[PDB]
Amino acid sequence: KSPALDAVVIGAGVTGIYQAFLINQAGMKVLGIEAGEDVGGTWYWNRYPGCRLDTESYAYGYFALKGIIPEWEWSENFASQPEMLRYVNRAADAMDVRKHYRFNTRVTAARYVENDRLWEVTLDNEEVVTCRFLISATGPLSASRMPDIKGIDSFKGESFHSSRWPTDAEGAPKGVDFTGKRVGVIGTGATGVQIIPIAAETAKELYVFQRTPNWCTPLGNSPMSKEKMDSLRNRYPTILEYVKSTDTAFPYHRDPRKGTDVSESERDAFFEELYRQPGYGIWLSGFRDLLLNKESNKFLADFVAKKIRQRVKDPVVAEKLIPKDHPFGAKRVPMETNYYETYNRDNVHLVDIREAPIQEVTPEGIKTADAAYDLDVIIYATGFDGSLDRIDIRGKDNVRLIDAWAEGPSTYLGLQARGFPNFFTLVGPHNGSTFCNVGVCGGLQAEWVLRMISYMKDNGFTYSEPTQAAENRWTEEVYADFSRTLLAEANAWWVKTTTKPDGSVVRRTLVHVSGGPEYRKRCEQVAYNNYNGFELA
Ligand SMILES: Cc1cc2nc3c(=O)[nH]c(=O)nc-3n(C[C@H](O)[C@H](O)[C@H](O)COP(=O)(O)OP(=O)(O)OC[C@H]3O[C@@H](n4cnc5c(N)ncnc54)[C@H](O)[C@@H]3O)c2cc1C
Ligand SMILES: NC(=O)c1ccc[n+]([C@@H]2O[C@H](COP(=O)([O-])OP(=O)(O)OC[C@H]3O[C@@H](n4cnc5c(N)ncnc54)[C@H](OP(=O)(O)O)[C@@H]3O)[C@@H](O)[C@H]2O)c1
Ligand code: NA
């Protein structure tokens, strides 16, 4: 029995559509599957107020850099979601990729057929399709879901979850005019920090329910002149080589100096300058030991805390906005447009729900351990937590992917898992999404997988699976790299420690943090050497 398809690609975000385009371009038969109506992923689903890139538009736009849509015109230095969706749509047109997709269709199960070396993919628990290779591009973040909070359904006002915002016939978000309404926003991640300032413009009152403050820095967004855009486009071959060489694929690289190689005076001027410069420079152009050394991190953390105390008038509000929890840059840093100055407004209140946890949502609003809040609107900006978990993925011996990774993700090259032959996992925390410019990182990863699939076709191979030794070595290296950073202690739950019944200890990280260029170099050493570490047949 032979499969109907060379490959199934799950997902129509920037990663999946590019992967599908590439497979078809190589003269293979691909079917893409997408839950939503159309292309975009992130940029299709997230329509909340203030949704905007943290990556410079020209650097995220890999499809423009690569010469798929080089004529593309960015209107701002950090594109908003509507422009992002137009971008993805234009790319999809040029790739002529929509014809290879089933939209409005959810993959419910994927089961590997050992005797046939193929994947049975189940669509909406009904139709089954067969493919040689299954490729997930289901997103590094999973699921809009109501958060773990009692009484959400009881609220009589307007509810919004940030990743499911209601829209009008044009696709533009609706119910965004908060004139005369008392608003609650739960969560202060990158999503909340984008919503809060804009909600404040129209809301009668705004309560921010903050469980943990993040380190946020100014975005410094501005419009993009035609002159600048043309100048950038002309420089695209240089820009593409540059972003292909930095550790994150953002257009920034670490200063070669340690924090202690300069005086306190010099560090101060250095930070002051970066802080005022648009984009991630203050994080990604920092001293080389910023994420390796406690003292170095403290220099910058102390500086950013100084800035928060500058921008927020009330000294009490300010200290509750400054993290003590974690080092600077240990989470992907939220960038902001006048975030801190929002709290200076009369109609804006910070509610500390660490000290006073939410007990439940109510017909009238929200109830904390020591107060009740009457509200007309609640916005859940409460995040995402994996996209693969929602699919019943079964490998050899009917083993669940969920179980195989229960002790932490285990892969070779971040791309295949032993037990799951012919299955590629694109763009997730386990292969570097967390801190990447995903437009570039994801695109490069899809090209590598294409090259592997093409090699197998050329050689008549129909089976690929990592050896246990290659997978173990790779996964142990990924942990070792991670453990040398400050992230190890900062996010404890990012490490899975298993002490087996026999007494041995296994440590895995949920988050791969190695430099992109180094990671790709390793992938090419493997590929060139006839995919050493993969069993192929
Ligand atoms: C608000 C927001 C802002 C961001 N900004 C940046 C940024 O500035 N820079 C950056 O590098 N990264 C950013 N990211 C991270 C972002 O995930 C990537 O930039 C990128 O969009 C990921 O693309 P993707 O194709 O891999 O996944 P997605 O864009 O998430 O697409 C995955 C698709 O798969 C579909 N899918 C999932 N499961 C199934 C299934 N079972 N069956 C059928 N379809 C399924 C989903 O519907 C979705 O459309 C941001 C993320 C968010 C949420
Ligand atoms: N380009 C951009 O500027 C942009 C915009 C949005 C998102 N993103 C990316 O997408 C990722 C997700 O960001 P996000 O802001 O949507 O989510 P997030 O980072 O996970 O933050 C969710 C927020 O909600 C809180 N929270 C979660 N569950 C809660 C509950 N049950 N009750 C009360 N509070 C709760 C969290 O607090 P705790 O910390 O205590 O859990 C946190 O403050 C980010 O890592 C970011 O990189 C990027
Ligand atoms: Na105030």
The residue whose C-alpha atom lies closest to atom 10 belonging to ligand 2 is: 190
Mutation probe of ligand 1 site: the residue of 21, 33, 38, 42 with most atoms within 8 A of C-beta:
42
Q: What is the rounded distance in angstroms from the CA atom of residue 269 to the CA atom of residue 273? A: 6
Say which ligand is closest to the CA of 84: 1
Q: What is the rounded distance in angstroms from the CA atom of residue 245 to the CA atom of residue 97? A: 29
Question: Is the C-beta atom of 332 inside 6 A of ligand 2?
Answer: yes
Return the closest-CA partner of residue 364 out of 353, 354, 355, 373: 373
Residue with tokens 């943090």: 513
Instruction: Report how far ligand 2's centroid is from the alpha carbon of 23 (Å).
Output: 34
Whether 159 and 182 share a structural domain: yes
Q: Which of 384, 409, 437 is the endpoint of a domain?
A: 384
Question: Is the C-beta atom of 12 inside 6 A of ligand 1?
Answer: yes
Query: What is the chain's length?
Result: 537
Q: How many CB atoms lie within 10 A of CB 256?
A: 8
The residue whose C-alpha atom lies closest to atom 48 belonging to ligand 2 is: 190
Task: Report how far apart, in Å, the C-alpha atoms of 470 and of each of 42, 411, 423, 480, 483 are.
Answer: 33, 9, 16, 15, 20
Task: Report how far apart, in Å, the C-alpha atoms of 317 and of each of 186, 347, 371 are.
Answer: 17, 14, 18
Look up residue 179 and give its DSSP letter: B
Instruction: Report how far ligand 3's centroid is from the alpha carbon of 349 (Å).
Output: 5
Task: Report how far apart, in Å, the C-alpha atoms of 384 and of each of 4, 163, 302, 405 are.
Answer: 34, 9, 29, 19
Question: Is the C-beta atom of 432 inside 6 A of ligand 1?
Answer: no
Question: β-strands 30-33, 5-10: how paired?
Answer: parallel
Q: What is the rounded distance in angstroms from the CA atom of residue 438 to the CA atom of residue 426? A: 11
Structure token digits, residue 413: 């090259």
Whether 139 and 51 share a structural domain: yes
Whether 229 and 368 share a structural domain: yes
Residue pair 63/17 in contact (Cβ under 8 Å)? The answer is no
Question: β-strands 118-123, 127-136: how paired?
Answer: antiparallel
Whether 454 and 519 share a structural domain: yes
Question: Is the C-beta atom of 333 inside 6 A of ligand 1?
Answer: no
Q: Which of 339, 358, 384 is the endpoint of a domain?
A: 384
Residue pair 25/14 in contact (Cβ under 8 Å)? The answer is no
Residue with tokens 């904390």: 368
Residue with tokens 């992130």: 42
Task: Report how far apart, in Å, the C-alpha atoms of 150 and of each of 29, 125, 154, 266, 368 are.
Answer: 47, 31, 9, 51, 12
Mutation probe of ligand 2 site: the residue of 81, 382, 427 with most atoms within 8 A of C-beta:
382
Contacts of 494 (CB under 8 A, 6+ apart): 482, 487, 488, 509, 510, 511
Contacts of 350 (CB under 8 A, 6+ apart): 208, 210, 317, 320, 321, 343
State whether residue 336 is helix, strand or coil. Answer: strand
Element containing residue 231 per DSSP (H, E): helix 226-234
State whether residue 512 is helix, strand or coil. Answer: coil
Experimental method: X-ray
Residue pair 119/41 in contact (Cβ under 8 Å)? The answer is no
Looking at residue 423, which CATH number applies to its domain? 3.50.50.60
The residue whose C-alpha atom lies closest to atom 19 belonging to ligand 1 is: 438
Whether 213 and 291 share a structural domain: yes
Whether 27 and 172 share a structural domain: no
Atom of ligand 2 nearest to the CA of 335: 3
Handedness of CA 9, 10, 11, 15 (dihedral sign): negative
CA atoms within 13 A on the CB side of 194: 25
Instruction: Report how far ligand 2's centroid is from the alpha carbon of 146 (Å).
Output: 13
Neighbours of ion ligand 3 (CB under 5 A): 348
Q: What is the rounded distance in angstroms from the CA atom of residue 308 to the CA atom of residue 406? A: 40
Atom of ligand 1 nearest to the CA of 106: 42
Q: What is the rounded distance in angstroms from the CA atom of residue 258 to the CA atom of residue 19? A: 39
Question: Which residue spans within 400-528 are E strands per DSSP?
Answer: 423-425, 464-466, 495-499, 505-509
Q: What is the rounded distance in angstroms from the CA atom of residue 243 to the CA atom of residue 56? A: 11
Mutation probe of ligand 1 site: the residue of 65, 438, 445 with most atoms within 8 A of C-beta:
438
Q: Which of 343, 367, 384 is the endpoint of a domain?
A: 384
Look up residue 332 and give its DSSP letter: P
Which string of DSSP letters, residue by residue, matches 51-104?
A: -B-SS-HHHH-HHHHTTSSTT---SBSS-BHHHHHHHHHHHHHHHT-GGGEE-S
Q: What is the rounded distance in angstroms from the CA atom of residue 376 to the CA atom of residue 177? A: 12
Q: What is the rounded distance in angstroms from the CA atom of residue 208 to the CA atom of residue 198? A: 13
Look up residue 215 and give its DSSP letter: P
Q: What is the rounded distance in angstroms from the CA atom of residue 174 to the CA atom of residue 489? A: 42
State whether residue 298 is helix, strand or coil. Answer: helix
Say which ligand is closest to the CA of 52: 2
Residue pair 11/137 in contact (Cβ under 8 Å)? The answer is yes
Return the closest-CA partner of residue 433 out of 491, 521, 492, 519: 519
Q: How many CB atoms lie within 10 A of CB 469?
A: 11
Task: Report how far apart, in Å, the C-alpha atoms of 138 and of each of 61, 120, 170, 425, 437 are.
Answer: 19, 17, 26, 9, 17
Q: What is the rounded distance in angstroms from the CA atom of residue 331 to the CA atom of residue 189? A: 10
Contacts of 402 (CB under 8 A, 6+ apart): 389, 393
Whether 306 and 187 share a structural domain: yes
Whether 374 and 392 share a structural domain: no
SS3 track for 443-462:
HHHHHHHHHHHHHHHHCCCC
Whether 84 and 172 share a structural domain: no
Task: Give strand pairing partners of 208.
Answer: 185, 350
Q: What is the rounded distance in angstroms from the CA atom of residue 54 to the CA atom of residue 324? A: 24
Whether 16 and 118 share a structural domain: yes
Residue with tokens 């043309």: 230
Range of the domain at 337: 147-384
Return the closest-CA partner of residue 11 out of 112, 168, 121, 171: 121
Q: What is the rounded distance in angstroms from the CA atom of residue 259 to the CA atom of residue 480? A: 24
Return the closest-CA partner of residue 178 out of 336, 379, 43, 381: 379
The residue whose C-alpha atom lies closest to atom 30 belonging to ligand 1 is: 139
Whether 164 and 128 share a structural domain: no
Question: Is the C-beta atom of 411 inside 6 A of ligand 1?
Answer: no
Resolution (angstroms) stands at 2.0
Which strands form 372-374's sheet, in the order they lie side by side?
358-361, 365-368, 372-374
Whether 365 and 487 share a structural domain: no
State the total domains in the chain.
2
Residue pair 359/369 in contact (Cβ under 8 Å)? The answer is yes
Q: What is the rounded distance in angstroms from the CA atom of residue 308 to the CA atom of residue 317? A: 10
Instruction: Report how far ligand 1's centroid is from the alpha carbon of 495 (Å).
Output: 24
